Write a protein that binds this DNA or RNA. Structure first.
Ligand SMILES: [K+]
Ligand SMILES: [K+]
Ligand SMILES: [Mg+2]
Ligand SMILES: [Mg+2]
Ligand SMILES: [Mg+2]
Ligand SMILES: [Mg+2]
Ligand SMILES: [Mg+2]
Ligand SMILES: [Mg+2]
Ligand SMILES: [Mg+2]
Ligand SMILES: [Mg+2]
Ligand SMILES: [Mg+2]
Ligand SMILES: [Mg+2]
Ligand SMILES: [Mg+2]
Ligand SMILES: [Mg+2]
Lengths: 845, 781
DNA sequence: GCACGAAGTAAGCAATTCGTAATCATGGTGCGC
DNA sequence: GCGCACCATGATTACGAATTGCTTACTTCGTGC
DNA sequence: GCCTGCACGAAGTAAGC
DNA sequence: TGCTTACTTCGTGCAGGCAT
DNA sequence: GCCTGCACGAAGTAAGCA
DNA sequence: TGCTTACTTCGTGCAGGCA
């Protein structure tokens, strides 16, 4: 059977204190139950706001009384809930705390504290603090307040409840600047819609387990429990408010019972007196317990696919708390329900499934881990030296210890550049991987770099936004850490003002590179106005697209407006700003302007005949320069060859006068002779190569004078260096001492992207020779083609953007086939193609 | 092997009509299912009032379409639900009606109508009208509207739903003056707390079965179904409103579906389009059906003690309707669940338990009765000649027919003075015992007295309050019936005004006896002011207790105030009204005044020294005068001439010689009771004059009998347990299926008979009581 | 416009560590003296 | 028949690539005459 | 079980033997 | 001139309904 | 973790001076 | 013929959302 028990190890005075506290808590929870009973019995009372306020007041007082249990945090020992010893686990948490209060936040956890206090004064001495729907506080924060015994924070009347502890719970979290991870961010996004969303609903909607959403009740974990724990431990203990609450709550409780007796007369023949409620405790609870059991067995049968018989048995066994079931060891589940399948238990208890179907553990080994650490997130929240201590003392088996260690390491070895040694040293230095990730988000860059082996790659992989800041020239480690701590992240540092960034010791070039305002500061003289434009509009391209009038409004010059939109000199001098800007934004290029508009249209728009001819293509200028073929006739001449000088010298002059309306036949041969006269000069200048000195100039531009002359002295001349660059001879370029990847990537475009994908310089060289540019690799290359070049499937998945489809234990070829048929990677219909939707549904994101 | 089937016997045009109506109902119920799906899936949607309004609108439209099924009430025949032919039963109801609509109010009853109409346009063409929790109407009234096909009454919009059909359902019942019996009165008491209380919850709280709470869907039965049927049939059919609803509902349904598609975007990635809902009907229903099955199997395991396997099998077989399980014959339960015990089936199906453990029926005979009449209340709702016709046609076996007959008669033979012959004649004259009791409640005294054998005792036992009115001198049968029909009951006749009672032809002495205002009319000159005081305060003793100032206000005289409180002449002349009245109400008697007060205190209160000190066998003619006073001169001289003298008559009276007093010709019970005090009460308890004589000799007064005598003591005197329960004031505790010994043990353990009704339910189960009797006495919870 | 820094980054280099392909462990399955 | 040959899958080896630090050797920026 | 409604003996006050 | 029938005024109480 | 939208310099082709 | 601004179209990579 299930074991609920605990023993009292305090003094007799403390014994009387704890008994009085627990009995007042039972009185308060009786009130909770009686108010819900009245709500269920009368349809009029179900709508009464007074009765709901009374119900929430009872919840508040129950929480206050619960917080005062085990104040010295030592009056109880060997607290057992459903057969799990909480004493050992609470000690291993970073914040420690009382095992009594830690137990009472579980379903029917009061049964241990009740036995420890030899309580028999009531029928069911129940105390519960898991209220959700009608709770006047945010439920998780309520439970965490009880776990940490905060009587100062537990309000004793509904009016005293602050909005930052209820619907505006987000305000209280932001007040204390607590590091929040991605999972907690998605959970908060759900909770902002409805703070009273039940936790299993968040788990279902986010595709996590209940254990993943809640987390460990300690600031060093991940989940809503861990998040509130982080927030609460940073709240200083307000002793005066605690004493005031203790003074008020007893007299308040008697007032609530009298208010209920007064209110029950409005709806019943027999008023709900305290005597009546004590003499009917089983009548009140029975309905609520029955609906609990029904909903629990339904969730087990529906969402977890457990047989109706087994699901109903388990709902009966654990008072219908699916949170407690999914954290119960397999042996105990089989003890209370012998027909349970191991597969069903692995279905409901996802920690057991992870320990078996990934770490190949025995059911008993996984039971060890579940009894000691409850969940995987509980293992991650436990210090590594604590696990080694448990293993040395013989309290943990070898298989369980090895599995827990590999679980701890895997949380960090997944990071790029961190292996077993660096993860080992990080865990030694900071205890558990959750704390490591916490220090990473808090931007403790120097604190992390002090560990042996934490270099540039590890910092770029761990500290968010460190890679973006440290890559900027002039910004060193200390400046990056200072900025990230001052503003709160790379995104917040990028949004900072120019003046305050100058105050931090940033050059105008550094700020210009950070914000990307070089193009904007090429127009406006200063950086402040460019940054303000980036604030208002958000993108320089949007500022370019802005109409001429709105650009003139709050603008500086019309020549500046023409420089912004890239208006040609001919187009800006031939027309006004409005018409020229409209033409440029409608056609794009001056050649398209000359092609799709007629000469008469250009004249009507107010262009000089010579200027209107210059707006037209240079073919027009050549035609009129040779023998004045005419502004009216040169257009019809260019209308046949589609504005192409090559097709003009091809066909016979007889075929030329055929298409054009009117053409002199003697002139028809003088224009073909002039067309052939220029295709000999277009070809003479088209096939041209630059000089050796010009290659030297480009090399000095790209890699500086020193490395350029080193390359020139190594090979023949700068012409040979350019020949090797155009052929993508990365291997030969790297042979030169003093030439590395930061020079080759600056010489050969696209080498940096290929090296970032994990490609050997020889592999990047082969790829660049095969496809010629990374853009053509990403769109054109196929996985089999890349395997012909000798690339591993990991590099192929990296370079083709198919990392999502491979992360679900799937191959790269069939992954590319989906990106081939449909447009994107994101695109029931899969059963038509014959796919197992299991992984697609499993990985949500 | 459950049989859900029905055959169509209308025309092809009518066939298309019925098919179109059924398909529109399926559309509406799909809307219901989809709104429920959204509500169960999201906790935020569970609180969305807009989604609830949409859901209730869908429910309303489903009900409206359901009412229009089988309007000619002849388009279907051989309607089979779970293997029961409803055609035969609906015909035997007083109001008849459509077997199609009668079937559709059952769980998965649409499966018979769906087969009758060859419906295949949807995956599960389900139409259900049993909604309870979220139903915008009172659920039982909703179902009774559908069963009677009242399309005029089914609202089509939540805003058009009248309060008299929802939270104020009591108004609609009172509007039509429908006779309500005690079981229906307790059911109404529960429903006033929560009109949407599910019927099995009412069954638990009242300690009844579900069939007892529901009753037959017909005005001549007992239960909430029967009550609403009584109320609905008295509502005239508003044809124009029905046509208006038929006009509106199609476009309203299309607007509801558009509103659902718009609202579903707030909660889902794929909006709930009609196409999506039709192409996913099994996914939507899958969750809801499983929750129904779980609740049903759980209730079967806990409240009925059925094995988990068998309970889950029964819940799955009948789609989780415990009302349907308790009305299913044993053969069907064993067919769908072969491991079911006969004892488990008798636990869940209380009609089967009654037919076996009381009428010694075979399981097959009880199954016969359950197939034909569903429940005991269904047997009581069927005419007796209908049952005899069924027996003559061979449709009912010998054992089943005899059991049904004994059940019908027992409903009337239990009344005092009604035996087998009189019950037989009453059933012949009015068809079924429910109709007999109904006419009794309707105060149809002349209609009942027309039956051969219906005399004074039978009328006093049947017509409520007839015994109280007819006992008043001068009030005959016709006047009693007139008053009971004019005011609505003996209590209402007592509350009537004096002027309107005088207009009916009542003497002032008759009204004074009825209202009990003789003491009040001895103070006030007229009857109207005494009646107004009885209205204001309710009791003459309450008027006596009134303070001196409130009695003086709107009062007449101070001497009258002193006469009311019974103030002695010495106490009223020695002090004023205030102090004397306070002393009299604090001490009671002048002797206590003189004992507990000092002479100096009396002087200080303003009393004269002399007054304060004072405050501090017969002959033959003499006995003959008393005899002339008690029984008149004639009977007195008759008694004197029969015996020795008036002294001998007095000697026999003091010894309670009732037997010898009754020997005298011309001397009856009304004379002996006026001579021997307490004889009237003992005769009214059903005691032989010899038995009353023995009791009066043994204890000396009825007051000392009621407090001192024990049931064994009275059984030593030779009294039947019925007479013992009558005479000891335990008639309440015995009428609740308890014996007289345990009734006296309850009056002994707990203080009074009233004090047993406020005891803990745990201590009553400790005494070995069933929740039926516990609910009769106090009531769960 | 160019001297002339003034920090700051690119490159090298040895030792260590990462990390993924190569191989080993292990449990089946099929062709032959 | 009893061994070995060839797979098949997951686990573990193993060795080339990347990383960690530390130290020069140039490289943009950027003032001032 | 409260409530209406006479009964009746007790007892203090007077007329009559 | 002092003891009896006689007769109100209390004070207490049972009986008979009716309602649960 | 993909994806659109920028930033921004690269680069191939010609007029403008030189 | 040759050295610069001048207009065109990419191609290279970083960042910010969103599921
Ligand atoms: K290293
Ligand atoms: K190996
Ligand atoms: Mg403290
Ligand atoms: Mg050891
Ligand atoms: Mg890694
Ligand atoms: Mg630590
Ligand atoms: Mg370091
Ligand atoms: Mg930098
Ligand atoms: Mg090199
Ligand atoms: Mg026959
Ligand atoms: Mg009888
Ligand atoms: Mg009839
Ligand atoms: Mg008669
Ligand atoms: Mg009469």
């Amino acid at each position: 059977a299930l074991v609920y028990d605990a023993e009292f190890v305090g003094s007799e005075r403390e014994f009387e204190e704890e008994r009085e506290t627990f009995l007042k808590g039972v009185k308060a929870y009786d009130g909770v139950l009686a108010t819900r009973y009245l709500m269920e019995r009368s349809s009029s009372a179900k709508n009464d706001e007074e009765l709901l306020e009374l119900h929430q007041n009872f919840i508040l007082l129950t929480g206050s009384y619960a917080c005062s249990i085990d104040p010295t945090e030592d009056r109880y020992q060997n607290v057992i809930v459903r057969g799990v010893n909480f004493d050992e686990r609470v000690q291993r948490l970073s914040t420690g705390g009382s095992p009594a209060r830690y137990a009472i936040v579980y379903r029917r956890g009061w049964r241990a504290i009740a036995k420890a206090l030899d309580i028999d004064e009531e029928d069911v001495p129940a105390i519960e603090v898991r209220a959700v729907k009608r709770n006047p506080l945010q439920p998780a924060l309520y439970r965490i307040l009880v776990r940490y015994g905060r009587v100062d924070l537990m309000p004793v009347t509904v009016d005293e409840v602050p909005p930052e502890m209820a619907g505006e719970f987000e305000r209280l979290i932001e007040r204390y600047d607590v590091p929040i991870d991605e999972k907690e961010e998605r959970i908060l996004e759900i909770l902002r819609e409805n703070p009273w969303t039940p936790h299993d609903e968040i788990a279902r909607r986010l595709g996590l387990s209940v254990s993943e959403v809640e987390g460990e009740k300690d600031p060093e974990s991940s989940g809503i429990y861990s998040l509130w724990s982080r927030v609460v431990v940073n709240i200083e203990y307000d002793e005066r408010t605690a004493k005031r609450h203790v003074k008020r709550r007893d007299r308040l409780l008697e007032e609530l019972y009298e208010h209920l007796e007064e209110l029950s007369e409005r709806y019943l023949r027999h008023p709900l007196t305290r005597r009546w409620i004590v003499e009917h405790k089983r009548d009140i609870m029975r309905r609520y317990l029955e609906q609990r059991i029904v909903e629990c067995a339904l969730k087990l049968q529906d969402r977890y696919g457990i047989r109706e018989d087994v699901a109903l048995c388990l709902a009966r066994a654990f008072d219908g708390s699916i949170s407690m079931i999914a954290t119960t060891p397999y042996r105990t589940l089989k003890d209370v329900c012998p027909d349970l399948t191991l597969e069903e238990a692995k279905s409901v208890n996802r920690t057991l499934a992870t320990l078996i179907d990934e770490h190949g553990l025995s059911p008993d080994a996984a039971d060890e881990l579940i009894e000691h650490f409850e969940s995987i997130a509980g293992i991650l929240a436990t210090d590594l030296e604590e696990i080694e201590r448990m293993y040395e003392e013989g309290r943990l088996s070898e298989e369980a210890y090895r599995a827990a260690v590999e679980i701890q390491l895997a949380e960090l070895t997944k990071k790029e550049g961190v292996g077993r040694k660096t993860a080992e040293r990080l865990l030694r230095a900071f205890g558990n991987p959750e704390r490591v990730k916490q220090l990473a988000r808090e931007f403790e860059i120097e604190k992390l770099a002090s560990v042996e082996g934490v270099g540039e790659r590890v910092l770029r992989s761990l500290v968010p936004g460190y890679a973006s800041l440290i890559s900027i020239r002039g910004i060193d480690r200390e400046r990056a850490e200072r900025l990230l701590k001052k503003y709160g992240g790379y995104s917040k540092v990028r949004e900072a003002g120019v003046e305050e960034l100058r105050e931090d010791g940033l050059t105008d070039a550094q700020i210009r590179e950070l914000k990307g305002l070089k193009t904007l500061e090429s127009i406006v003289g200063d950086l402040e106005k460019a940054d303000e434009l980036k604030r208002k509009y958000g993108s320089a391209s949007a500022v370019r697209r802005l109409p001429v009038e709105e650009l003139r409004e709050l603008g500086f010059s019309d020549d500046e407006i023409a420089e912004i939109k890239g208006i040609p000199k001919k187009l800006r001098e031939a027309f006004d700003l409005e018409t020229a800007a409209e033409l440029y934004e409608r056609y794009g290029s001056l050649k398209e302007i000359g092609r799709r508009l007629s000469y008469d249209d250009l004249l009507e728009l107010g262009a000089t005949p010579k200027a209107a001819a210059e707006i037209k293509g240079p073919e027009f200028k050549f035609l009129l320069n040779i023998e004045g073929v005419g502004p009216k006739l040169a257009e019809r001449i260019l209308e046949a060859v589609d504005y192409d000088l090559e097709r003009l010298a091809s066909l016979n002059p007889e075929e030329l006068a055929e298409k054009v309306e009117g053409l002199g036949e003697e002139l028809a041969e003088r224009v073909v002779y002039a067309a052939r006269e220029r295709v000999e000069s277009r070809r003479k200048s088209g096939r041209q190569e630059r000089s050796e000195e010009e290659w030297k100039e480009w090399l000095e531009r790209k890699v500086g004078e020193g490395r350029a002359r080193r390359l020139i002295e190594y090979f023949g001349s700068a012409g040979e260096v350019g020949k090797l660059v155009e052929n993508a001879e990365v291997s030969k370029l790297l042979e030169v001492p003093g030439i590395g990847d930061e020079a080759v990537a600056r010489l050969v475009p696209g080498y940096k992207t290929l090296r970032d994908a994990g490609l050997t310089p020889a592999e990047a060289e082969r790829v660049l020779k095969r496809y010629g540019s990374v853009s053509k690799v990403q769109e054109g290359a196929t996985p089999d083609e890349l395997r012909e070049l000798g690339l591993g499937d990991a590099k192929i998945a990296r370079i083709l953007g198919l990392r999502s489809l491979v992360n679900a234990r799937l191959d790269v070829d069939t992954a590319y086939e989906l990106a081939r048929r449909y447009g994107s990677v994101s695109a029931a219909e899969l059963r038509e193609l014959g796919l197992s939707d299991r992984a697609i549904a499993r990985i949500a994101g």
